[PDB]
Amino acid sequence: RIINGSNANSAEWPSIVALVKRGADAYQGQFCGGSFLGGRYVLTAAHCFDSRSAASVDVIIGAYDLNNSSQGERIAAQKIYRHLSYSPSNLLNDIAIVELAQTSSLPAITLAGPATRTSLPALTPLTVAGWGITFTPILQEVDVDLVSQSLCQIVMQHGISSDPNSTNFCAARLTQGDAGGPIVVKTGREQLGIVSWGDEQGTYGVYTNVSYFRDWITKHTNQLSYDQVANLGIRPLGKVSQSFTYTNLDANALTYTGNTFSSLPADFSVLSDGCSTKVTLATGESCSVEVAVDAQHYRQYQYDFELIFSYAGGSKRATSRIQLDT
Numbered sequence: 001r002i003i004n005g006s007n008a009n010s011a012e013w014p015s016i017v018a019l020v021k022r023g024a025d026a027y028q029g030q031f032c033g034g035s036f037l038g039g040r041y042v043l044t045a046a047h048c049f050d051s052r053s054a055a056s057v058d059v060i061i062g063a064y065d066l067n068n069s070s071q072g073e074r075i076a077a078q079k080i081y082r083h084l085s086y087s088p089s090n091l092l093n094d095i096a097i098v099e100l101a102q103t104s105s106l107p108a109i110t111l112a113g114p115a116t117r118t119s120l121p122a123l124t125p126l127t128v129a130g131w132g133i134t135f136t137p138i139l140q141e142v143d144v145d146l147v148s149q150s151l152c153q154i155v156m157q158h159g160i161s162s163d164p165n166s167t168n169f170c171a172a173r174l175t176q177g178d179a180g181g182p183i184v185v186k187t188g189r190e191q192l193g194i195v196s197w198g199d200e201q202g203t204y205g206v207y208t209n210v211s212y213f214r215d216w217i218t219k220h221t222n223q224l225s226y227d228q229v230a231n232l233g234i235r236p237l238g239k240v241s242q243s244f245t246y247t248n249l250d251a252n253a254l255t256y257t258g259n260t261f262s263s264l265p266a267d268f269s270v271l272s273d274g275c276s277t278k279v280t281l282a283t284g285e286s287c288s289v290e291v292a293v294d295a296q297h298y299r300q301y302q303y304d305f306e307l308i309f310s311y312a313g314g315s316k317r318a319t320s321r322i323q324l325d326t
Contacts, residue, residue, distance in 0.1 A: 001125075003174045005133035005142040010064040010071070013129055015109035016139060017042050018063035019098070019180060022056050022076065027066035027137045033130040033181025035191055036061045038108035040100040040249075041221040044180035045194050045208060046082040047094055054080050059098060061106050066137040076101040081220040081228050083213075084304060084321060090158040092167050094196045094208045097220040109182065112190040117211035118164045122148045125186035128195060128205075132177025143186065144171040147204050156198055156206055167212060168196060170204035183207050223250040224309070224316045232324040241271060241292045244320050246307060248281040254316065255280050256287070258308035267294055268303050268322075275307060291322055300325050 017034035019042075020026050031052075034044035042059050049057075054077045062072035079099035086093045124146040133140035147155075152170035153162045160168060171183065176199040183193040193207030210217075226246040248254040256275040261268075268291065275287035293301050302323045309316045 001174075002127065002141055002143040005140045008064070008129055008139040008141040010062075010139065013064070013139060013141070014062050014107045016061075016063060016129055016182070017044070018060040018066060018072075018131065019044060019048060020058050020060060020066075020074075022058050026060055026063070026069060026074070030066055030131055030178070033178050033195065034059060034098065035109045035182040035194075036104065036106060037097075037111070037217070037221055039221070039223075040103045042098040042100065043109075043111075043182075043191070043194065043210075043217065044096050044098060045094050045196055046086040046096040047088060047091055047196070048180045049080055049082065049096060050088055054078055054098075057098070059100060061104050064139050066131070073104050073106060075104065079225055079228070083216060084229075084319060091197050091206075092159050094168070095194060095213055095216065097217065099225055109184075109191050110189065111214065111217070112185065112192045112211050114211050114214045116185070116190065117169065117192060117209055120146055120185070120192075122146050126171055126183050126192060127186050128171075128176070128181065128183045130176075130178040130181030130195065132181075134177060142173065144173050144183070144205065146171050152204060152206070155202075156204055158197075158206075160206070165212060166209065168206050168208050169193065170198070170206055172204050173199065176200070176205055219317065222316050223248070224254070224318055225249050226318045227320060228318075229321045229323065232322070235295065235324045235326060237295055237326060239292050239294050240324060241290060242322055243288050243290045245286050245288045246275060246281075246318055247286040248283060250311065251283055252312045253280055253282050254309040254311050256307065257310045257315070260306040264303050264305060267296075267301065268292070268305075269294070281309070293322060293324065295324065295326050298326050
């Protein structure tokens with residue numbers, strides 16, 4: 001029982017990931033943790049990217065001593081997918097995928113099953129891992145106990161549900177600085193959660209619930225690479241335009257078969273739909289769509305649209321967002 005945090009044994013954490021600022025020393029630049037899901041995908045917390053984007057981020061898979069650049073593979077991020085219901089005020093749906101500029105073949109973590117979280121009694125032993133645990137260049141671990149969901153809500157609040165079948169849960173230390181890292185079931189090692197918030201200093205730590213998010217994760221680790229969110233921030237009135245690119249990284253061809261453009265209002269318009277010109281997307285092929293918003297009022301604009309593709313395996317959906325404020 002690892003009651004106080006302690007230097008981890010690295011062979012027990014081959015799938016851990018350090019998120020580090022691009023172009024910087026790994027130790028100085030580390031800002032979050034993550035877990036490697038296989039191929040080119042890393043699982044982490046959405047709020048790690050409140051003020052950062054893909055091109056400023058590397059990951060180090062199987063990192064352990066951040067000062068030892070021969071441990072783990074350092075790889076550039078190329079895309080970030082955050083939950084589109086992520087809210088930074090109270091950090092609900094605090095989850096994100098980092099799509100990497102190349103695949104790794106290092107071992108992947110095993111995620112907990114959709115039914116696992118609600119199966120676990122309170123006090124189920126769990127283990128958290130990362131560099132913040134309470135900075136040192138060495139990966140730390142510590143044990144924590146699962147807390148009653150009704151209790152988690154009362155103590156921590158910030159929109160936490162009393163229903164265990166929800167976005168996040170709590171776990172208690174027996175006596176934390178880097179979000180995004182994994183919490184795993186101590187027996188079996190399946191990643192049950194993602195470090196989100198709490199425990200900054202009579203509080204619990206709050207962890208994004210991986211069981212509740214398996215479909216969302218599957219949807220964003222599906223070898224369809226695209227621009228998710230174009231946030232244009234504050235803008236004057238007028239037609240604003242923005243291109244979005246969709247790329248098939250799968251070995252089987254993709255066929256553009258639908259979208260949700262109809263459902264959006266008159267403010268929104270499609271200036272150009274390259275995917276309708278190309279229609280079919282072989283391996284490595286891209287198509288782009290160019291959308292616009294005629295902002296004529298003073299308000300927040302946030303429009304979500306979905307492109308749907310058929311493929312041998314079934315179908316794939318990319319959901320993008322254009323956002324701005326006047």
